Amino acid sequence: ADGVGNASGDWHCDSTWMGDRVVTKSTRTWVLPSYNNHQYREIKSGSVDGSNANAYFGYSTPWGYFDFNRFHSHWSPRDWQRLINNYWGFRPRSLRVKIFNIQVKEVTVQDSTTTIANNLTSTVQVFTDDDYQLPYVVGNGTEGCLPAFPPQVFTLPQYGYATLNRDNTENPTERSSFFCLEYFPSKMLRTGNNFEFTYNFEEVPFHSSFAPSQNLFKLANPLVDQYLYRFVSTNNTGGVQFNKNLAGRYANTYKNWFPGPMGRTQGWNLGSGVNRASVSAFATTNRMELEGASYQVPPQPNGMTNNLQGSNTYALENTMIFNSQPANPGTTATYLEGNMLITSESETQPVNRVAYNVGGQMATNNQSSTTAPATGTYNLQEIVPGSVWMERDVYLQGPIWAKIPETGAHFHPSPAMGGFGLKHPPPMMLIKNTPVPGNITSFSDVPVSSFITQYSTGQVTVEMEWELKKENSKRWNPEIQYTNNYNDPQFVDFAPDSTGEYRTTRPIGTRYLTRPL
Amino acid sequence: ADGVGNASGDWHCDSTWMGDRVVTKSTRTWVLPSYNNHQYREIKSGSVDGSNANAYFGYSTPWGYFDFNRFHSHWSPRDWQRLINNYWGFRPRSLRVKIFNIQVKEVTVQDSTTTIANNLTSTVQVFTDDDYQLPYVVGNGTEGCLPAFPPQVFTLPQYGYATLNRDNTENPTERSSFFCLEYFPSKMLRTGNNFEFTYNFEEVPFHSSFAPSQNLFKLANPLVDQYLYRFVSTNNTGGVQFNKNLAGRYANTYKNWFPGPMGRTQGWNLGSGVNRASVSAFATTNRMELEGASYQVPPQPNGMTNNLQGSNTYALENTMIFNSQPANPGTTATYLEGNMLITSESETQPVNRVAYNVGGQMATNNQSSTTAPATGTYNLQEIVPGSVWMERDVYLQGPIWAKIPETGAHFHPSPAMGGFGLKHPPPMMLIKNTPVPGNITSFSDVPVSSFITQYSTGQVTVEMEWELKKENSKRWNPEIQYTNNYNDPQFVDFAPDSTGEYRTTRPIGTRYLTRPL
Amino acid sequence: ADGVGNASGDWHCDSTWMGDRVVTKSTRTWVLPSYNNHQYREIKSGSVDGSNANAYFGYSTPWGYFDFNRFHSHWSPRDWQRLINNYWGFRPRSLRVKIFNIQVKEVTVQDSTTTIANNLTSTVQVFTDDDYQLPYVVGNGTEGCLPAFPPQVFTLPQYGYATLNRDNTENPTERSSFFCLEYFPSKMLRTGNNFEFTYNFEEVPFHSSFAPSQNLFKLANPLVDQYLYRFVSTNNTGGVQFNKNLAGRYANTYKNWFPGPMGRTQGWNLGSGVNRASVSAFATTNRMELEGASYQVPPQPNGMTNNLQGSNTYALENTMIFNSQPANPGTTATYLEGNMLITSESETQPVNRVAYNVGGQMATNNQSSTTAPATGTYNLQEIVPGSVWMERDVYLQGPIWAKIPETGAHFHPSPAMGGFGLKHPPPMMLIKNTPVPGNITSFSDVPVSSFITQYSTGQVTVEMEWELKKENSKRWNPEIQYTNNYNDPQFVDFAPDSTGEYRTTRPIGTRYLTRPL
């Protein structure tokens, strides 16, 4: 055990469905560049694109990190289908990760030959941050996760963070903090060594994957009248007149429950919708301010629906928008509807309010004999006693969890992009190549800047356990399922191309089952 | 036991007050029509009264149901008085129901004789829905409950529900679901058989029946000044000037706590108030939208008061409005103030904001040497950190509980109409007459459409246990009680008329006791 | 227990999914006419419609019978979907039936009043035939089964059978046998009595519900050549020349396995296909002869596919054709494509041969220097060593089982219409009303022909246990599911109409999952 000619792990990719629970095992091959040539660099930006919200001050590190936080890392398209068609809900239970079969490669360039050899004595460093003392960059929707497709090899992303900057500039504050990652204890691994970590998720609610089977305002019996009466009109000398609420008249009935909060965001017509020409669209987006700068919040808060059933109007600032294929870093190219995976929340429309319409109206004045009653519409409304809504749906291409910010207070900690809000998420796993100095023939007080250039590769297996919520329903007629349906397919979706490129043409969400309110 | 000549239950109507707890027993006689002639009919509506919110798609069933959900079903007017005068709070604990003394009657019409006989071999079917797999129609404020007055006989209401319709029309969606009620296991009862069910309420907060004994903003000591200072003015070269907050000046004092949320709804003058002539009042009501339709929400959310103490101005869309007597189904008649039982929340005015006034004002600009400070009022405000309000009061004529809709998320699940929000309420009890075919002399593949016409009757006893919260108070002077007080009574209220009609002339709420904030 | 005022059973309709197994419980209400006025009548026919195959000799009996043999009797449309989307196979395990809540009704007609009363002393007779000594009429695809929809009431069909007739006429043979059903012991039931029976299915293979994921002739690796060589041509002085079999050339490769048997039946174009005008189609159907008469065999034997994928050509004599709604007995009306539920076997096309094409070709001569090689096609081929095929698919509207005829010998006892061939099927349950004589004031030697006219009704519960075969598959991409998908629905399918009529618009088969050969 533990030698250069002995493998330190095996390939595990499987999914075991047992009763309620399911365990998903996933193995990938990674490669780790040596970033910043073993340096910590201070990174910063001023206002770019004419927005001082793009200014920041921070640090980039030599370290890379493992990111497990998208669903397609863990789940197959066929196992995701088996989940969403058969179950009302799921939540994560446990996690364990293993890093094995480490091999370090030294690369040397003489007159552009660039030969590569392996250094058997070189080391890699790995630590997990269990106390959450570092900036947690994982849940923020950024690339670098394990691939969706198991044979694909991936580079680990470089670790970095932004601290406080002052006055919306690139300059630091006195509260700007520097975190050194070598001031943690870490484990040093040669070829025969491996690393293992285990984690238990805290108790969270099930993600509810079902759609409401009736309307929030239609909950009353259509056959029977209400014993309740409504103010209707007023007569020639105004006294107040009342009518009884009748049967299936749902405009007029009394309500116990009210929809979730809403802001109003601009709707845009996809497909054959006409829209408007030559809009720059940045000035008219919804925004919030912090510290004197104005930020776009491209996901909105929960409690709205971006699309209304089979309409082509979308809010686009209430939407999660994906690309059908991965892109190069820093691409400024413009894309169109056909390139994009544009999700729809319309299965929540019974309980949620559409984002591109007003939320209602209220009285704007006091009536008199002289003045008539008046109303006006409101474009935004917030949490109210007796509100019910549905959370953002989760997709096979989307994030699993987020970390709740550490502050005095918060309300209903559900992430806007989706998934499970976690006070103590799965910890970050950080990894770097240990530096090997070059030829140094003399003593100097200044640190060693000349290093052998190296990279390392290996495998990482992740094993998650999921608790499932059975579907128990008395619905007689058949339901909507996620099916594989294509008219005149020229390729099969979720399979490699003739080149070897893996194709995913559409988003897959969780809510196909239907349940009564 | 269990025969045609042996009674399967006894009449229990009692209330036993023991220490904290009280058990209320209630027995009634019911009659069950055979609805839809043993058919399931698809019911639907388009926009009626010029509102597409009145459109629906649904189903009506042969089944009837038992509805226990109004307070006067369980409580006497004298036991309700004993409760509200002596106690700070109450909540339900357990429930048990029994259905006994079943008798089925066959009715036959030859040349308009319409004779009635009893069918000793006929059956009735009863099931309780313990898993909440059906649409729950009970808590929605619709008629058909056990009578307030024990000798009265009542028909069971027909069970029905609305599912999804599309595009605000009468047409179904793909997610429109059909629920068959014969796909449940049920218990079949002949004459000697009876049915029994027991239920335990989940832990809920006490309904707080008391009124606040002081003002939310007046909580400070009037004798002593605050050590806190306020911005007062600015001088000829504007520097900021401050004064000390003095003693009993409550406009200027610092506050820890803030009132509950509010929308603004139109106030209308009852009694001698002048109002305004010939208002249609539908266009100017407060509304919300779902799915592209606009609904009236005739109860508003909690945290407001409809009436302000002894004023005659009422919001009428913040009010629960009752009739002094039951009405025929589908009555379009117009009613006036004298016919109506119009409740007042004014006992909550210290902590709650009046619905027909603005909620406050805030700064609308940035001052400068050139521009002066400006404000504007707001007509709506929502939940805020450090808010305190009181929930809708419960009445002897009103609902006991509601079911919290099954969705990902909700906030403060208190029903707008009143009572206790319950994730798992008392289950629905559904009952139908089993069909008896007529004379069929041949075989056919089509189902049997010819049936003996029948109805059944019986008794139902309901027994609830209530936990009480004792009144512990150091108030020296006497309090306000609910008393029986009428000037020149021509009849006694809450007693039968000379015809036998039971009269209830006024609403009775729970908050007569007073308690300091 | 066991009295006129005590119910002898309860309503059970449920489905319990536990691991592999599932138990489906089903309760219905039946009505039993008194058939033939308590007589055994000899029934017979000569050649009708110009076919002596329509001639028969037989007997009709006073008895009715219970028929459990269609899938929709046991299964819901939502439980059928849950089955076919998630599982590779199923077979029945046990069965138990209960007949309870019997009530007999006497009907009397004076001057067309036709009053109905119940006779509490009357009896009904029930026996089960465990030894299979009667003609077994159940598995033959005839109407009278428990309804698909639980609230529907159904008449029991009259029991009858055909025996030997001679020379294709209506006259009996010497081997024509008469079976009296009173010569069995049976159980006599009054109002308080009930009947119960239990049965265990014999070991049968799972119905395989999956589709083949590749082609029978394409099983070879497309990347590698065969070490086997083929006769290709012959040169100017004919010697034999050979080529190697290359890679993905599947016309030329060697085969281990061969398709199932086929006959050739005429294809007809549904939908927009042009077809041919004014065909009487009876003369050109496929037939077999027995005893000098010629019969249509509207299902063919197994091993063919009626439709070829997305073509509109159907064999129509290889198809199971259903009506969307039940029909009156003896209807001669003509129907069109839109009224019909026309099943497609096309999911079996990889392994099965299309019915409307030739099956292949073989050598018709011996070559010489003078004569060239010749072939000809064949329209029919039978079982061959090394044949593989798939059995007829089962539908929610189709039969569950059939009885294997009792004879010396049989081959591969799979029913042509579908389901499970059973040597000992679930026994027949026969039921009649016991006769009550009218007023007889004298003695006579001739039997009593005057009877009180009566009918009976009651409930019947059936409980089946099913063994399931889990789906274990490494397919990466999503599969085809049965989904509820309709463009512009005016009603929901598998739900009652506005009249109460239950609508089923399409057939639902079992093979949506895919599995490699």
mmCIF file of C-alpha atoms in Angstrom, chain B residues 1-4 36 38-44 57-60 62-63 106 108-111 118-125 163-164 166 170-193 432 434-452 454, chain C residues 1 3-15 25 27 29-35 70 76 79 100-103 105 107 113-116 118 120 143-144 149-158 191-192 326-329 453-455 457 459 484-492 494-502:
data_model
loop_
_atom_site.group_PDB
_atom_site.id
_atom_site.type_symbol
_atom_site.label_atom_id
_atom_site.label_comp_id
_atom_site.label_asym_id
_atom_site.label_seq_id
_atom_site.Cartn_x
_atom_site.Cartn_y
_atom_site.Cartn_z
ATOM 1 C CA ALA B 1 -76.233 -4.511 19.414
ATOM 2 C CA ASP B 2 -76.219 -3.441 15.755
ATOM 3 C CA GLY B 3 -79.754 -4.111 14.512
ATOM 4 C CA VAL B 4 -82.738 -2.331 12.974
ATOM 5 C CA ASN B 36 -75.917 14.459 -9.411
ATOM 6 C CA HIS B 38 -74.849 9.289 -8.656
ATOM 7 C CA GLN B 39 -72.777 10.967 -11.382
ATOM 8 C CA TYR B 40 -69.537 12.899 -11.525
ATOM 9 C CA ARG B 41 -70.143 16.017 -13.586
ATOM 10 C CA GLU B 42 -67.496 18.332 -14.977
ATOM 11 C CA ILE B 43 -68.435 21.892 -14.003
ATOM 12 C CA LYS B 44 -66.938 25.031 -15.511
ATOM 13 C CA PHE B 57 -62.782 24.436 -14.332
ATOM 14 C CA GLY B 58 -63.699 21.727 -11.850
ATOM 15 C CA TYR B 59 -65.797 18.740 -10.818
ATOM 16 C CA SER B 60 -68.907 18.128 -8.734
ATOM 17 C CA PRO B 62 -72.134 12.618 -5.600
ATOM 18 C CA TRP B 63 -70.579 13.029 -2.151
ATOM 19 C CA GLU B 106 -86.704 5.523 -0.746
ATOM 20 C CA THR B 108 -91.363 6.923 -5.343
ATOM 21 C CA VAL B 109 -93.589 9.105 -7.523
ATOM 22 C CA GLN B 110 -96.607 7.648 -9.309
ATOM 23 C CA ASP B 111 -98.986 10.255 -10.824
ATOM 24 C CA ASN B 118 -87.502 3.261 4.246
ATOM 25 C CA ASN B 119 -85.062 0.791 2.700
ATOM 26 C CA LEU B 120 -83.576 -1.314 5.490
ATOM 27 C CA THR B 121 -80.992 -3.001 3.274
ATOM 28 C CA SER B 122 -79.533 0.188 1.792
ATOM 29 C CA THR B 123 -76.073 1.430 2.707
ATOM 30 C CA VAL B 124 -74.279 4.753 3.169
ATOM 31 C CA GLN B 125 -70.528 5.204 2.607
ATOM 32 C CA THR B 163 -58.767 22.643 -10.745
ATOM 33 C CA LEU B 164 -56.498 24.527 -13.113
ATOM 34 C CA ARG B 166 -56.049 27.903 -18.787
ATOM 35 C CA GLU B 170 -63.299 27.519 -18.762
ATOM 36 C CA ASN B 171 -60.925 25.112 -20.493
ATOM 37 C CA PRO B 172 -58.610 22.717 -18.628
ATOM 38 C CA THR B 173 -54.826 22.579 -18.504
ATOM 39 C CA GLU B 174 -52.664 19.458 -18.804
ATOM 40 C CA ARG B 175 -52.132 19.775 -15.058
ATOM 41 C CA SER B 176 -55.868 19.753 -14.366
ATOM 42 C CA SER B 177 -56.364 16.750 -12.113
ATOM 43 C CA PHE B 178 -59.379 14.549 -11.497
ATOM 44 C CA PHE B 179 -59.870 12.927 -8.093
ATOM 45 C CA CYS B 180 -62.223 9.959 -7.807
ATOM 46 C CA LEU B 181 -63.610 9.544 -4.297
ATOM 47 C CA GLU B 182 -64.415 5.853 -4.724
ATOM 48 C CA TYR B 183 -60.685 5.218 -5.087
ATOM 49 C CA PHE B 184 -60.435 5.662 -1.332
ATOM 50 C CA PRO B 185 -61.313 2.850 1.082
ATOM 51 C CA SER B 186 -64.529 3.766 2.877
ATOM 52 C CA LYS B 187 -66.819 2.236 5.466
ATOM 53 C CA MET B 188 -70.268 1.028 4.434
ATOM 54 C CA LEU B 189 -73.051 1.490 6.980
ATOM 55 C CA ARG B 190 -76.532 0.039 7.240
ATOM 56 C CA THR B 191 -79.160 0.928 9.845
ATOM 57 C CA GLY B 192 -77.443 -0.691 12.825
ATOM 58 C CA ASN B 193 -73.922 0.421 11.921
ATOM 59 C CA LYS B 432 -72.682 9.433 -0.079
ATOM 60 C CA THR B 434 -74.752 3.937 -2.282
ATOM 61 C CA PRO B 435 -76.677 3.560 -5.573
ATOM 62 C CA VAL B 436 -79.478 1.025 -5.907
ATOM 63 C CA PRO B 437 -80.215 0.238 -9.577
ATOM 64 C CA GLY B 438 -83.737 0.157 -10.910
ATOM 65 C CA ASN B 439 -85.248 -2.674 -12.878
ATOM 66 C CA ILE B 440 -82.729 -3.850 -15.482
ATOM 67 C CA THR B 441 -84.008 -6.782 -17.521
ATOM 68 C CA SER B 442 -81.185 -7.028 -20.085
ATOM 69 C CA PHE B 443 -77.411 -6.940 -20.387
ATOM 70 C CA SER B 444 -75.701 -3.824 -21.710
ATOM 71 C CA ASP B 445 -72.108 -2.635 -21.879
ATOM 72 C CA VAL B 446 -73.028 0.965 -21.006
ATOM 73 C CA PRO B 447 -73.289 1.680 -17.258
ATOM 74 C CA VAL B 448 -76.586 1.612 -15.391
ATOM 75 C CA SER B 449 -78.259 5.030 -15.465
ATOM 76 C CA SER B 450 -81.573 4.103 -13.785
ATOM 77 C CA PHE B 451 -81.561 4.226 -9.991
ATOM 78 C CA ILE B 452 -83.981 4.123 -7.105
ATOM 79 C CA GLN B 454 -83.161 7.776 -2.082
ATOM 80 C CA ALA C 1 -73.083 -9.888 12.444
ATOM 81 C CA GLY C 3 -78.405 -9.476 9.598
ATOM 82 C CA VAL C 4 -80.626 -7.233 7.484
ATOM 83 C CA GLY C 5 -79.425 -4.065 9.239
ATOM 84 C CA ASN C 6 -75.705 -4.898 9.341
ATOM 85 C CA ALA C 7 -73.370 -4.377 6.395
ATOM 86 C CA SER C 8 -71.431 -7.473 5.356
ATOM 87 C CA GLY C 9 -68.488 -5.651 3.773
ATOM 88 C CA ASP C 10 -66.729 -2.351 3.203
ATOM 89 C CA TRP C 11 -65.567 -0.424 0.147
ATOM 90 C CA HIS C 12 -61.903 -1.105 -0.682
ATOM 91 C CA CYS C 13 -60.277 0.663 -3.636
ATOM 92 C CA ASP C 14 -56.566 1.278 -3.151
ATOM 93 C CA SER C 15 -53.143 0.465 -4.565
ATOM 94 C CA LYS C 25 -57.920 -3.399 -4.523
ATOM 95 C CA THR C 27 -64.733 -2.522 -5.481
ATOM 96 C CA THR C 29 -71.552 -2.328 -7.654
ATOM 97 C CA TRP C 30 -73.281 -4.931 -9.835
ATOM 98 C CA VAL C 31 -76.844 -5.774 -10.811
ATOM 99 C CA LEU C 32 -78.001 -9.242 -11.849
ATOM 100 C CA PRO C 33 -81.020 -9.732 -14.126
ATOM 101 C CA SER C 34 -82.920 -12.986 -13.943
ATOM 102 C CA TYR C 35 -82.095 -14.433 -17.339
ATOM 103 C CA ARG C 70 -59.383 -6.458 -18.244
ATOM 104 C CA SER C 76 -55.955 3.312 -12.378
ATOM 105 C CA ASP C 79 -51.108 3.669 -11.341
ATOM 106 C CA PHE C 100 -71.165 -8.718 -0.141
ATOM 107 C CA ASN C 101 -74.142 -6.475 0.682
ATOM 108 C CA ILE C 102 -76.630 -8.545 -1.302
ATOM 109 C CA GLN C 103 -80.106 -7.105 -1.767
ATOM 110 C CA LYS C 105 -85.663 -6.580 -5.324
ATOM 111 C CA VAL C 107 -90.787 -5.814 -9.202
ATOM 112 C CA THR C 113 -97.352 1.123 -12.375
ATOM 113 C CA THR C 114 -94.247 -1.131 -12.043
ATOM 114 C CA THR C 115 -93.518 -0.746 -8.337
ATOM 115 C CA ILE C 116 -90.311 -2.150 -6.837
ATOM 116 C CA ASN C 118 -87.205 -5.642 -1.699
ATOM 117 C CA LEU C 120 -85.678 -9.900 2.476
ATOM 118 C CA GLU C 143 -67.734 -7.526 -22.833
ATOM 119 C CA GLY C 144 -69.224 -7.548 -19.335
ATOM 120 C CA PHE C 149 -64.322 3.796 -13.551
ATOM 121 C CA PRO C 150 -65.265 2.826 -9.971
ATOM 122 C CA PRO C 151 -68.585 4.674 -9.502
ATOM 123 C CA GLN C 152 -70.080 2.995 -12.589
ATOM 124 C CA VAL C 153 -72.667 0.253 -12.005
ATOM 125 C CA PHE C 154 -72.643 -2.740 -14.331
ATOM 126 C CA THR C 155 -74.864 -5.676 -15.234
ATOM 127 C CA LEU C 156 -73.436 -9.153 -15.044
ATOM 128 C CA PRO C 157 -73.387 -10.919 -18.434
ATOM 129 C CA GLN C 158 -75.413 -14.042 -19.113
ATOM 130 C CA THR C 191 -79.098 -10.183 2.776
ATOM 131 C CA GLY C 192 -76.678 -10.676 5.665
ATOM 132 C CA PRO C 326 -68.854 1.432 -24.735
ATOM 133 C CA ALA C 327 -71.533 0.503 -27.248
ATOM 134 C CA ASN C 328 -75.032 -0.926 -27.175
ATOM 135 C CA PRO C 329 -75.414 -4.687 -27.754
ATOM 136 C CA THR C 453 -89.866 -11.378 -11.219
ATOM 137 C CA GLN C 454 -86.792 -10.252 -9.305
ATOM 138 C CA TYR C 455 -83.284 -8.901 -9.616
ATOM 139 C CA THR C 457 -77.589 -6.093 -6.638
ATOM 140 C CA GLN C 459 -70.862 -5.128 -4.278
ATOM 141 C CA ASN C 484 -50.153 13.490 -20.275
ATOM 142 C CA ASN C 485 -49.780 15.683 -23.345
ATOM 143 C CA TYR C 486 -52.576 17.381 -25.258
ATOM 144 C CA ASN C 487 -52.566 20.457 -27.464
ATOM 145 C CA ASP C 488 -55.551 22.699 -26.702
ATOM 146 C CA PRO C 489 -57.520 20.306 -24.458
ATOM 147 C CA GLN C 490 -61.272 20.912 -24.326
ATOM 148 C CA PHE C 491 -61.608 18.188 -21.661
ATOM 149 C CA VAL C 492 -59.237 16.148 -19.542
ATOM 150 C CA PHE C 494 -59.583 9.724 -18.331
ATOM 151 C CA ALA C 495 -62.105 11.869 -16.453
ATOM 152 C CA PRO C 496 -65.892 12.316 -16.561
ATOM 153 C CA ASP C 497 -67.553 14.491 -19.170
ATOM 154 C CA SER C 498 -69.905 17.340 -18.263
ATOM 155 C CA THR C 499 -72.669 14.743 -18.629
ATOM 156 C CA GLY C 500 -70.825 12.250 -16.439
ATOM 157 C CA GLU C 501 -69.557 10.037 -19.270
ATOM 158 C CA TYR C 502 -66.035 8.739 -18.730
#
